[PDB]
Amino acid sequence: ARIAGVDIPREKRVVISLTYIYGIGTSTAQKILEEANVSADTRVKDLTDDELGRIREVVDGYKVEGDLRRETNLNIKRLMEISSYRGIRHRRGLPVRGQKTKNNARTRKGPVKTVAN
Amino acid sequence: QVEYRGTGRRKNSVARVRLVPGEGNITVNNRDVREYLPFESLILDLNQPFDVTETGNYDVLVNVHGGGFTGQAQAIRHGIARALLEADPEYRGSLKRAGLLTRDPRMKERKKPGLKAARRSPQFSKR
Amino acid sequence: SIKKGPFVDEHLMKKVEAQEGSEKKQVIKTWSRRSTIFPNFIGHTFAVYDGRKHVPVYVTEDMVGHKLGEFAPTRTFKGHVA
Amino acid sequence: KIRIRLKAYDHRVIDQSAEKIVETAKRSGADVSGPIPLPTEKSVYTIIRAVHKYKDSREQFEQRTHKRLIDIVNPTPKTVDALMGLNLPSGVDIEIKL
Amino acid sequence: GQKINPIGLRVGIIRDWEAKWYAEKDFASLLHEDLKIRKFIDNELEASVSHVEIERAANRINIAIHTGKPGMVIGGSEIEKLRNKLNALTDKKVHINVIEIKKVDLDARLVAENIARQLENRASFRRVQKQAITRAMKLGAKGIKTQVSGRLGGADIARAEQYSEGTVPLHTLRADIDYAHAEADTTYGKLGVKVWIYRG
Amino acid sequence: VPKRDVLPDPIHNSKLVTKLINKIMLDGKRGTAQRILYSAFDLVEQRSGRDALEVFEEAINNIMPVLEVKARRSNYQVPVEVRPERRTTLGLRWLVNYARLRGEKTMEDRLANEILDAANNTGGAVKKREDTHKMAEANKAFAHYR
Amino acid sequence: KGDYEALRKLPRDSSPTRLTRRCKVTGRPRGVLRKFEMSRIAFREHAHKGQIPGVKKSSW
RNA sequence: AGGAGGUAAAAAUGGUAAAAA
RNA sequence: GUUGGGCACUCUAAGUUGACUGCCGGUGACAAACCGGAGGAAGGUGGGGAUGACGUCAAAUCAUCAUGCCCCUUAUGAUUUGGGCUACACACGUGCUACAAUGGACAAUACAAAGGGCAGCGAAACCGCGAGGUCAAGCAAAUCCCAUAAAGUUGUUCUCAGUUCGGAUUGUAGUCUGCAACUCGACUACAUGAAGCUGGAAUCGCUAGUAAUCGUAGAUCAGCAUGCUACGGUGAAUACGUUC
């Protein structure tokens, strides 16, 4: 069922359906399913209500998705106000990591603007 | 106690054959051939020498190294064929027609300079 | 990245502690862009060599662990048409 | 025992250097193991045959190394300085590992 | 252009290396100070030298000079003073031998330099090759080819004239074919000569 | 320039079951190709209640054509008769290429429905044989004499 | 500037990662193999004269 | 062998001027 | 196979035997030669390489080198530090990874050839979730090390969903080489989860151990490989006739 303030797909397995929460991937899902002693092969449809609260109790130790938005965006918003190198690359809309911008910056550049002379 | 031996080479793999009279079950590298080879279709062509000469009462013990499982099994039939000719010279004519006696000379070709493989060329451009 | 202490250049750090005796004046010239900004570096305004000239740069209390050179941009890009 | 490794660049200047050393061992009797050939160590160099352009035209160069291993047992007083005394043709070095 | 050195193909088949020594370590440094021995000889020697072949052992280097006039290299006071210069350079001991050559014009190293020094005397390029073609065929050459290329008569644009007499099979690899390219430095620039001689 | 030889399979001892393994073989991997053909015969025998080779020999003849066009020269198609080995070439190639376009979610399941369909004289690989006779019998008129 | 480039390479530098390598015959910085210490152009004319010991053309 | 009558429609353009017995 | 023995088998690399249209049949101007057949590991220049006639394109290089002539010489030569060769509205060439079920993930287990190693190759053990860290056995090589070969096979599981497909993008925390990774290195771990559902007009390579696919090694190099050069595993389909 619903856990940690987010809706969960019910038909799938627990260790896959916990990766639908922003902040939990394939490793930190199993790192809850190994300490709380819940069988990893259970369906989310077929839990009881005791094992649901046991998983839900330890999840709030890890950062929820509401925390991670203001934690990640504050790491970007302090980079722009100090006028760093990659602070202004966030403003330009260009790749941060130093990729060659001759041909492919298309994830940041977006759609194409075809001209020639 | 009489024991006929043959050597069989195919595709960077060589074989050493010791055959004893007994039940017709192949032994290779001190194991059984069920786990040693993934496909039973290979067993049909390494039992091809016993088919054409019509005999049997032969228990073969093989020792191979090098190559992969096609060349390391289709070289075993080369050793079986050259050891059955040590048992009877008259058996040669039945082995000659199928071609089990001869060795395949097909080995891997050389990567030439300028080409990505032996016979593979880079893509051509504005002509 | 380096697990060793953030990179000290012996000439740069010498004259930063030679500023905390009487007064924090506003200009020291430096050619070190590879020097990590220490927590002692704050309050002093440097002059890095952009290339053409030394450009001004101030350090606030949000610059620890950042290089001295990344605040000065070396190549300038104006718009392709505007 | 006495281990003698010959190493040269030719299969002919090392073929006579193996036989000419082994008679001098036989002059002190017997017990010298025959020449057993070791696998060669050959190295390939691939250079562009042009000067400026033309990456697709190369030329393949080769350097080979040939080996012979001779073992001698039961050393005698005459046999030591005898094989040390004779001078092999240039291009092959003796590695004596007694 | 589109032909290789015929001497360079046949090294390892029917030609021998000029250097004969094995070096497990220091093979880079023991080669480039051996490359200065043969550079030192070819400048000082005018004795017409074909081979500067080298054998090396521990503490020694053997120098088997092949030359046209052997008395110029032999001299006593001429040879040992050269040996004194060779001992000073490498700080190792050398041992020089001098080998002569009969049939001077049957060696393509010496036909190439003789033509190139006569072209600096500005003699006609068509007849410097033609005497060289005639002289070898009487001395016993089964074939000979000679080529001079460049600004031949002093012309503003370059060309190349060549001559032959007899068979010179260049695709046959068991054929022993001598070859050398020498230079003439004119006031009009450079000048390349090339001589093939096939003796059988 | 001849075709060399192919030896039969161990299970059925036939020349054109092992020739079908080569057509299903993608990327030079033979082991996956054998499982798709040896297990689809087990699925056919569950549906049909017949021998797997017996449904196979029936469905192969329902795909194999007898007379096909050829483009030569405006646009002319000339119907010629087919050699007895291009029939097995065109036959079981249509059997595998039209079985990948079935719509089921397993090629182990897609291959066992085409041999079930084509034995009952219907299907995608059978209507290709219908449209290589129909195309070759509209223009049978002009092209045989020339 | 080929004279000062071959001349600046011979003395030891302040930092031991500034140490480039060049040809010994021609003083070329690229395409030089460290076993012979000569460039790809100087390696070809020496092999074709027969002066490097034990080197031929491979045709395997 | 010789005479006679005809071809599965289509499909433009490309300054100037020299090299060398 | 580790030690006693053995050079039978394999392997190593030196020397030799062998393939020539040399026998048989037929056609052929009795000739050249073609179509078969025997023996034979191999048959019709066995497979592949190296080898590029005279000439053509005022084709490429004066920045490998060498050089006729021309220019600079208180600079167009020389020194160091920082920067740039890595920019970015776009257009093109060559590749890599994908769009999934002939698949993705987790376990167990199978078989190579080639080549490199002296202050270089780093065995084992212990430590770290991993990249790695400590201590160092042996080894100038058919010995020791790089080095578990991968695809494969046997099992469990996922169920046609932009997903348990894809791994771009960005945040944090690291490891290592180096005097020093801001412009501007490689890798790891966690979180993030972009376009992408087989590609218009046009276009490319390939005839057999080849196409396709799967790993491995070397040179350059302190550190850095989707490139280049080499090596083996699995391994097809098709040639009717033309050359319009």
Ligand SMILES: [Mg+2]
């Ligand atoms: Mg091109």
Ligand SMILES: [Mg+2]
């Ligand atoms: Mg460097």
Ligand SMILES: [Mg+2]
């Ligand atoms: Mg026209």
Ligand SMILES: [Mg+2]
């Ligand atoms: Mg031009």
Ligand SMILES: [Mg+2]
């Ligand atoms: Mg600089």
Ligand SMILES: [Mg+2]
């Ligand atoms: Mg995945």
Ligand SMILES: [Mg+2]
């Ligand atoms: Mg889909």
